[PDB]
Amino acid sequence: GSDDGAFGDIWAYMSEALTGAPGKIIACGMLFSVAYFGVVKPNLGLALVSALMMLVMANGEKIISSFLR
Amino acid sequence: GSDDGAFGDIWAYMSEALTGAPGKIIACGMLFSVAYFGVVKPNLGLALVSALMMLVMANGEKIISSFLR
Amino acid sequence: GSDDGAFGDIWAYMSEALTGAPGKIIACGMLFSVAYFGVVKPNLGLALVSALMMLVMANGEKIISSFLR
Amino acid sequence: GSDDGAFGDIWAYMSEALTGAPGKIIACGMLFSVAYFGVVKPNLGLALVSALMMLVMANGEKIISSFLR
Amino acid sequence: GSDDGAFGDIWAYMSEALTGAPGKIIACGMLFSVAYFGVVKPNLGLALVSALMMLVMANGEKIISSFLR
Amino acid sequence: GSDDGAFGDIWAYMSEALTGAPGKIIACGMLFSVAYFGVVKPNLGLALVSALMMLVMANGEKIISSFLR
Amino acid sequence: GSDDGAFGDIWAYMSEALTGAPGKIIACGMLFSVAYFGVVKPNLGLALVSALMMLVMANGEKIISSFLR
Amino acid sequence: GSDDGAFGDIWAYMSEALTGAPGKIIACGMLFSVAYFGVVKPNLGLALVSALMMLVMANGEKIISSFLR
Amino acid sequence: GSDDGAFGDIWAYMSEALTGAPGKIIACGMLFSVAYFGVVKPNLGLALVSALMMLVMANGEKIISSFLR
Amino acid sequence: GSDDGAFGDIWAYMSEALTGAPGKIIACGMLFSVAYFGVVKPNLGLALVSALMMLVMANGEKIISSFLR
Amino acid sequence: GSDDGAFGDIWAYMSEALTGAPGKIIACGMLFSVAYFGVVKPNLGLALVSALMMLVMANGEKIISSFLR
Amino acid sequence: GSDDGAFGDIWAYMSEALTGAPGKIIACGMLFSVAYFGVVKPNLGLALVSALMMLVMANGEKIISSFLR
Amino acid sequence: GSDDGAFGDIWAYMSEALTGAPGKIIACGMLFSVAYFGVVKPNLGLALVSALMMLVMANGEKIISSFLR
Amino acid sequence: GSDDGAFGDIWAYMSEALTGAPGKIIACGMLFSVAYFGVVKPNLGLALVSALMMLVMANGEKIISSFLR
Amino acid sequence: GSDDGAFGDIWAYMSEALTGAPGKIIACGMLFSVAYFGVVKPNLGLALVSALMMLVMANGEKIISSFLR
Amino acid sequence: GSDDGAFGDIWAYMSEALTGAPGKIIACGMLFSVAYFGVVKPNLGLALVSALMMLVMANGEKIISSFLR
Amino acid sequence: GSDDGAFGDIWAYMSEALTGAPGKIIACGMLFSVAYFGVVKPNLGLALVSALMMLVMANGEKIISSFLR
Amino acid sequence: GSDDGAFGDIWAYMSEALTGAPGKIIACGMLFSVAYFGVVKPNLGLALVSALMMLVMANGEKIISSFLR
Amino acid sequence: GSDDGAFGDIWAYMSEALTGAPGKIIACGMLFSVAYFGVVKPNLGLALVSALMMLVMANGEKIISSFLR
Amino acid sequence: GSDDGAFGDIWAYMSEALTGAPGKIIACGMLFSVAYFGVVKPNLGLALVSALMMLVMANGEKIISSFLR
Ligand SMILES: CCCCCCCCCCCCCCCC(=O)OC[C@H](COP(=O)(O)OC[C@@H](O)CO)OC(=O)CCCCCCCCCCCCCCC
Ligand SMILES: CCCCCCCCCCCCCCCC(=O)OC[C@H](COP(=O)(O)OC[C@@H](O)CO)OC(=O)CCCCCCCCCCCCCCC
Ligand SMILES: CCCCCCCCCCCCCCCC(=O)OC[C@H](COP(=O)(O)OC[C@@H](O)CO)OC(=O)CCCCCCCCCCCCCCC
Ligand SMILES: CCCCCCCCCCCCCCCC(=O)OC[C@H](COP(=O)(O)OC[C@@H](O)CO)OC(=O)CCCCCCCCCCCCCCC
Ligand SMILES: CCCCCCCCCCCCCCCC(=O)OC[C@H](COP(=O)(O)OC[C@@H](O)CO)OC(=O)CCCCCCCCCCCCCCC
Ligand SMILES: CCCCCCCCCCCCCCCC(=O)OC[C@H](COP(=O)(O)OC[C@@H](O)CO)OC(=O)CCCCCCCCCCCCCCC
Ligand SMILES: CCCCCCCCCCCCCCCC(=O)OC[C@H](COP(=O)(O)OC[C@@H](O)CO)OC(=O)CCCCCCCCCCCCCCC
Ligand SMILES: CCCCCCCCCCCCCCCC(=O)OC[C@H](COP(=O)(O)OC[C@@H](O)CO)OC(=O)CCCCCCCCCCCCCCC
Ligand SMILES: CCCCCCCCCCCCCCCC(=O)OC[C@H](COP(=O)(O)OC[C@@H](O)CO)OC(=O)CCCCCCCCCCCCCCC
Ligand SMILES: CCCCCCCCCCCCCCCC(=O)OC[C@H](COP(=O)(O)OC[C@@H](O)CO)OC(=O)CCCCCCCCCCCCCCC
Ligand SMILES: CCCCCCCCCCCCCCCC(=O)OC[C@H](COP(=O)(O)OC[C@@H](O)CO)OC(=O)CCCCCCCCCCCCCCC
Ligand SMILES: CCCCCCCCCCCCCCCC(=O)OC[C@H](COP(=O)(O)OC[C@@H](O)CO)OC(=O)CCCCCCCCCCCCCCC
Ligand SMILES: CCCCCCCCCCCCCCCC(=O)OC[C@H](COP(=O)(O)OC[C@@H](O)CO)OC(=O)CCCCCCCCCCCCCCC
Predict the structure, then answer these.
(1) Residue J53 to residues I48, J18, O33, O34, Q24, Cα–Cα distance (Å)
(2) Does L52 sit in the ligand 7 pocket, CB within 6 Å?
(3) Do residues P67 and P28 lie in contact, with contact meaning Cβ atoms separated by under 8 Å?
(4) Which residues of C touch D (CB under 8 A)?
(5) Is there an atom of ligand 8 within 6 Å of M54 CB?
(6) Cα dist. I33→F22, G4, I26 in Å?
(7) Distance between CA atoms of G25 and G12, rounded to whole angstroms?
(8) Helix-helix angle N21-37:I45-58, to 10 degrees
(9) Closest CA to H61 of H30, H18, H8, H31
């Protein structure tokens, strides 16, 4: 596909925000949720799942660009 | 069918936008939704479903052209 | 029935447009709707229903000609 | 009743047009409406209702001739 | 990614709060839960798991910044 | 009741279509739905229910003719 | 009441059509609807309700004649 | 009141037609409507309401004669 | 029943697609789901259930043709 | 069945991804889960079950192609 | 209250029908529903609730006459 | 207020009919509705609500006379 | 109550069908469900509950006739 | 009860299928489940329970016919 | 019972697979489990139980055919 | 058709105004409406529909010229 | 298209107001609605949707100018 | 954008009220809701979500001004 | 923010009521719920969670004033 | 906080009822539950936990007043 056009700016902003401030806020939210739910039931596996989700987010733009040319 | 006519330009724009900027924006929206809903309930299967939906979107024009000659 | 007459040209245009540019535009609209509604609730079954509707559209002229001789 | 008279030609034209070009145009309109309304809410039952209406149209002249002798 | 933008202040507040007062409150909650559940079943391994979770929290901002550029 | 009359052709077409192409299409739709919903939750009991519904469809004309003389 | 009069023929036609071709067409419509809605949600209870409605239709003329003398 | 007079014949005809052929035609219409609307939404309660309306019609002349002496 | 008619092409396409590309895609989806859910809870019985569902899909057209003549 | 058609590309991508990068990611996830759950309860049998699941995944395309012709 | 008047016949018919044929039909409907819903989830408590509802129906006329003098 | 006047007879008839034949017919209608809706969802609480409504109807004339002197 | 009237035929048909073909079909459905759910969790107590439900169905007409005179 | 009627064919098919191909498939499913669950926990008592369930299935039609006359 | 019908192919495949490749895979799984659990607690009696389970599997089709005629 | 004549100037002005200032004003009105209605119910699909309507407006002159020669 | 003409001032005012005071008022309205609806059901995803709508509004003039030349 | 104009005062009032008395009232409402819903189900995570929503509200004016220039 | 204005009195009342009579009533409700749910399952940890929620309520006004200036 | 106001009476009643009749009823319920569950599994530790919960209830008003000024 083409990254330009009438919606090029919106797509660019979303792609940079995926690894930018909103993405970091969401990742910090996952970290806070993992810490909070670990008070009663300590489970560090959810931390690993959160790290994997962060890795997926870091590669989200590449995946989208590969699937949608 | 025929890709030309009075509505040829609209169809062409929609077909290129399916894998273009609007399609990439929608895919980034799916990625953001997967990241956001994973804060409380971490579920990486929805990421796989989103990848499959992106693959379907990448093949949408081919499917439409095959069904509608 | 008879495909000719005073309204033969209108019927011919509609029959070719069912699988032509307007039909492809409508199918692309279904694909866009399926992609958009899958952001919050991923559901690939609606994609299958859309494919079935496209198959029905591809056979619409045959069905109409068979029912209305 | 009698199919002839001063209005025999009008009745003949209407009876042939029920399954002719105007009837096929109306059936194609139903198909287009079913396809269009299926973009947001996919519902293939309306296609079945449209097929039943087409079947009724194909038998309209017989029904009219049976009721009105 | 970029730490600035419209959501830079929110991200900064969350990053400092991860190791700040809310994070310390959550860690104290884990300590209280470990002490309380140890009344009937004494288990100091959960204290070690809580310490590991605190160590993860102390490194949460670094992990998020490394994954999300 | 009587199978003939002004609506005899419509009733005949519907009765043959119950076990004909439309009925087979609906049964294939049930099979596709059973296969699709079995991806996340494998449940072969719905296949048995679909087979029972197909058996009911195969006997639909007999049931209608018995109830409505 | 009296089954004869100026409207005796209309009443006779309606009474025979209740269990005749129109009634059978309506019952086949219920069967088709039950089959179609069972694709996504298999529910054979609606088939039982349809059978009960067919039984009511088969006794409709008797009920009307008993209530209206 | 008095059932005779200049309008005695009209009143007599209407009173006998309430439970006669027109009333039976209207009741058959209610039965047909109940059967038709039950194709998509099966609801046998409307059949009970129709039976109650038929019972009211059977007692309409008595009610009118009691209210209007 | 009859495999031909106005809906013969749709039925043929659905029957071949049951064991064709869409059916294989659905089966691959079941395999992916079995692999994904086996990360946390390894359960190879769901693989056997998926194989049985694939066997049912391979025999779906035969079952439909046997039930609906 | 046929591997080609409108959905041939999607099926091909899924079949190669079963043993490709997504399949390897899922297998690495199983390995990570086995390692993590072995910290408190060492169980190398789950490693054998994971190896068997990997073997099943390596043969998934063959199984699907054999069941669905 | 008074059981007679212009609506005495309607009230009498309804009171006898509560324990008459319509009431027995409704009770048989409850029995059929209890049997049908017990196929997947066997629950004989709903049978007890249905028996209690039948007991209430048998005493409905007495309750109405006691409340409404 | 005054119970007499030009509208004294109408008010008297309505007050006696509230607990008379029309009121009993309405109460029997509530009982029939409770029985009918209990076929699919058994709920005896609606019977209690119906009994309370009957009690309100039995006291309707007293309430009206107390509010409107 | 009275077994005759306008709804006597419907009540008779339902009473005979409770122990007739529909009742036997429902009982066979319970047997099939018990067999199917016993594949993963063998539980012969549900067979006893199904037998008790069949016994209740065999006595349903007697219970209805006793409660509703 | 009576084995004939509008639903006689459905009941006959279900009764023969209880000990026919579907019943044998379900029994083979129980055998496969017993074999699979015996890999980790060898328990041949579940095989005896499965044999008893097969014996119950072989006598299901007799039980249904005895309970429902 | 009858081994043929709409489900004859599925039953045949399951019966041959009981002693075929899936059955041999399950038996090899039992052997692997016996070997693995014998590392810490050597117990050759579980090998005898596994051999008995294999013997039961080899006779599963005969048992099913004898119980279900 | 011919773009010239007595009404050539009016047609030219309307055609340029479709994509000119009035068309842009109408499109801005759609954007304002989408923003305003999104305050209570956020729905970005209406933005996509508005973009499609803008695309239709951009091609309106071509469509009119193609249909009306 | 042309931004000038008789309606150039209106279009200019609307374009500047989209990102001006009215647009900021509408965005503040979305923020207030998100805060208010979060009192009973806390949902920060609606905040993300509101941010995306604000981003769309910021690019509305560019989209309109690109679609309408 | 421009903060001045005819709607500058309204925008200024809304921006100051977001962090002013109405915003504080809404935040106190969230605190009251969190306290009230914690009576039956104690959940302090909703307090964290409320704090995050308050942080978003404190940065709402900055976000709006950044998105809408 | 500013604590004064048109809504200053409402905000003041809510802030004092958070630690006033309504807040104490809610805290007593939490204590009553903890006591009541401890009858069957004694759990004093919920008392600690309730104390923490009370501490949060005591600091709610400070948190709101800090977040919303 | 302030113990007076519009809700002062409700708070006073709740505070006195915590150690009054409702609190004593709840404590007696805990004693009855401890006695009842001790029939099969004698456990006097639950009596100690109940005594501690009673001590907490006796100090509930003091705790609430200290936390909420
Ligand atoms: C101020 C202190 C720093 C924040 C500390 C805590 C942050 C919260 C995360 C952990 C709480 C976990 C326990 C929750 C307890 C819980 O049950 O939560 C339920 C609540 C609702 O989430 P869902 O809608 O997924 O849940 C549906 C049901 O679960 C409803 O209960 O979850 C959230 O709202 C938290 C996720 C937000 C995380 C993403 C936030 C970032 C996106 C927005 C960024 C701002 C956009 C601004 C645009 C203007
Ligand atoms: C420019 C970018 C490419 C377009 C991207 C998106 C296209 C829109 C489709 C997905 C949006 C889905 C979410 C919608 C959200 C939504 O609620 O939509 C509601 C809106 C109204 O649809 P209905 O009238 O079916 O809805 C009734 C109620 O639902 C009203 O809300 O749906 C549409 O207008 C979209 C369907 C148009 C699809 C067919 C268009 C092709 C036909 C016209 C071709 C041109 C004819 C020209 C003749 C001159
Ligand atoms: C006042 C005295 C000092 C506090 C002492 C005890 C503190 C509680 C911790 C130990 C209790 C353990 C036994 C619990 C017994 C138990 O079953 O708890 C269940 C309860 C609910 O937790 P989850 O939602 O994880 O549980 C789901 C199910 O388990 C429900 O039972 O757990 C908590 O609420 C405690 C965790 C809060 C810990 C994090 C608190 C800090 C985050 C909030 C900070 C304030 C944000 C303010 C924003 C305005
Ligand atoms: C040609 C193939 C054979 C037909 C196959 C399917 C037949 C349709 C039945 C199943 C579709 C179910 C899903 C529908 C999806 C759906 O939403 O339907 C909605 C549509 C409208 O029904 P209502 O007006 O009850 O609905 C009001 C709203 O629901 C509108 O949506 O229902 C029908 O038209 C079907 C019922 C007709 C059945 C009675 C037909 C027989 C009466 C006429 C006989 C001819 C008289 C001729 C006189 C000249
Ligand atoms: C690109 C990489 C290759 C794909 C890898 C993964 C594929 C996904 C399968 C495994 C995910 C399992 C965990 C899911 C996690 C999960 O919770 O999923 C939930 C989601 C929704 O499924 P249901 O509607 O059954 O679920 C209802 C609720 O469970 C909603 O959560 O499931 C799916 O969408 C996956 C099934 C699609 C499988 C069939 C797809 C093939 C049909 C469409 C073919 C295209 C038609 C095109 C027509 C134009
Ligand atoms: C960054 C470091 C490298 C990653 C290290 C760890 C990876 C996680 C695996 C081990 C954690 C085990 C303990 C978990 C603790 C746990 O309770 O997990 C629960 C969580 C939810 O899984 P389910 O939905 O199966 O669970 C349902 C309930 O168990 C919820 O608790 O499991 C996962 O999400 C992990 C499986 C993902 C494994 C497959 C990932 C690959 C598929 C996606 C590939 C990307 C697709 C991208 C498309 C855009
Ligand atoms: C003949 C057999 C004995 C009757 C058996 C059943 C009686 C019906 C009650 C139960 C049906 C419940 C399920 C209904 C299914 C249903 O959806 O009903 C809908 C229908 C319309 O009621 P509404 O107008 O309240 O409903 C508005 C919407 O719900 C329309 O669907 O309800 C009725 O007509 C029943 C209430 C009549 C009850 C009061 C009747 C007594 C007043 C009239 C007395 C005669 C006056 C004569 C003056 C000349
Ligand atoms: C063709 C082969 C012979 C049939 C073999 C299997 C028959 C099915 C029974 C066992 C399946 C159990 C596992 C199901 C898996 C399952 O989840 O089922 C769910 C499905 C829906 O049942 P409910 O509506 O009770 O369930 C609500 C939710 O559970 C939806 O999942 O259950 C049925 O449809 C089966 C009961 C029908 C049994 C009664 C049928 C006889 C009444 C109709 C007679 C015909 C009337 C014709 C009138 C025209
Ligand atoms: C292709 C190779 C031959 C097949 C080998 C294995 C067959 C599967 C049996 C053993 C697996 C045991 C471990 C399962 C692991 C497991 O957890 O299974 C769970 C899954 C769901 O069963 P339920 O719904 O009873 O379970 C509810 C929860 O347990 C969900 O996990 O069980 C089945 O689907 C297997 C039973 C099917 C057996 C009956 C099949 C025959 C009926 C259908 C016949 C076709 C009808 C066609 C109509 C068109
Ligand atoms: C690649 C190397 C060769 C494989 C070596 C080891 C194979 C595993 C057997 C021994 C492990 C024993 C210790 C396990 C440790 C353990 O705790 O296992 C637990 C795990 C789960 O089994 P269950 O669901 O019976 O257990 C329930 C709980 O025990 C969960 O822990 O057992 C299995 O998955 C192994 C049985 C599979 C054996 C049957 C496999 C053949 C059927 C599938 C054939 C493929 C179908 C394909 C269809 C597409
Ligand atoms: C003074 C304090 C600062 C204001 C605080 C709150 C502002 C309201 C926003 C949040 C309320 C959310 C809950 C509402 C509850 C609710 O149900 O609202 C319903 C109400 C009606 O909206 P719709 O017509 O979309 O709704 C149709 C149905 O939902 C009717 O209920 O929504 C609005 O009016 C709010 C949106 C206005 C937001 C845009 C305002 C800016 C445009 C006008 C600028 C002035 C133009 C002046 C020209 C002279
Ligand atoms: C008179 C004796 C003293 C009161 C003793 C008990 C007080 C109740 C608390 C413990 C019951 C726990 C077991 C409940 C069993 C239960 O299931 O409850 C369910 C019920 C509904 O609560 P939710 O809406 O959170 O629940 C949703 C679902 O759980 C519905 O079941 O909970 C409450 O209503 C209790 C919380 C009220 C506590 C706050 C009350 C103070 C706020 C109002 C102050 C007055 C405002 C006046 C303005 C005019
Ligand atoms: C008449 C004889 C004297 C009473 C003897 C026994 C009293 C019951 C206590 C011991 C039973 C223990 C075994 C239960 C077996 C059991 O499973 O119980 C379950 C049942 C439900 O409790 P939960 O809702 O905590 O349980 C949720 C699930 O466990 C449901 O099973 O527990 C209670 O209802 C007992 C607690 C009431 C105790 C508090 C009562 C005082 C509050 C109400 C005061 C009146 C307010 C009036 C306002 C108008």
Answers:
(1) 12, 12, 15, 19, 55
(2) no
(3) no
(4) 1-8, 10-11, 14-15, 18, 22-23, 26-27, 29-30, 33, 46, 49-50, 52-53, 56-57, 60-61, 63-65, 67-69
(5) no
(6) 32, 70, 10
(7) 19
(8) 160
(9) H18
Q: Which ligand is nearest to the Cα of residue I40, counting in written order?
A: 6
C-alpha dist (Å) from residue M19 to K38, K46, M24: 16, 19, 7
Structure letter (DSSP) for residue D5:
S
Spatial separation of the C-alpha atoms in residues L31 and K62, rounded to whole Å: 12
CA distance to C28, F67, H15, H48, K20, per residue, from G66 (Å):
58, 20, 17, 15, 15
Residue D33 CB partners (closer than 8 Å, separation 6+): none
Q: For a pocket test of ligand 1, which of Q33, Q43, Q44 has the largest count of ligand atoms closer than 8 A to its C-beta?
A: Q44
- Which approach determined this entry? cryo-EM
Q: Which of K32, E55, B10 is nearest to M53 (CA)?
A: K32
- Contacts of K among chains (3+ CB pairs under 8 A): G, H, L, M
Note whether J29 and I42 are within 8 A (CB).
no
Beta carbons of S28 and T65 less than 8 angstroms apart = no
Distance CA L31, CA K61 (A): 9
Contact R65, Q16 (CB under 8 A): no
- Give the nearest ligand 10 atom to N36 CA: 39
CA angle J3, J5, J8 (to 5 degrees): 55
Contact of H28 with G64, CB cutoff 8 Å: yes
- Contact: chain C with chain P (3+ CB pairs below 8 Å): yes
C46, containing H or E segment: helix C45-58
Q: Do chains H and K touch (3 or more CB pairs under 8 A)?
A: yes
Q: What is the resolution of this structure in A?
A: 2.9
List, in sequence order, the alpha helices (H) in P1-69. 8-18, 21-37, 45-58, 60-67
Q: Which two tokens stand for residue P44?
A: 């970005």
- Checking G41-45 for CB contacts under 8 A at 24+ apart, the result is G42/F30, G42/F46, G42/F49, G42/F50, G42/F53, G44/F49, G44/F52, G44/F53, G44/F56, G44/K36, G45/K33, G45/K36, G45/K37
SS3 F41: coil
Within 8 A by CB and 6+ apart from H11, the residues are H3
Q: Which atom of ligand 12 is nearest to the CA of R36?
A: 39
Q: Distance, in angstroms, between D7 CA and closest chain F CA?
A: 23
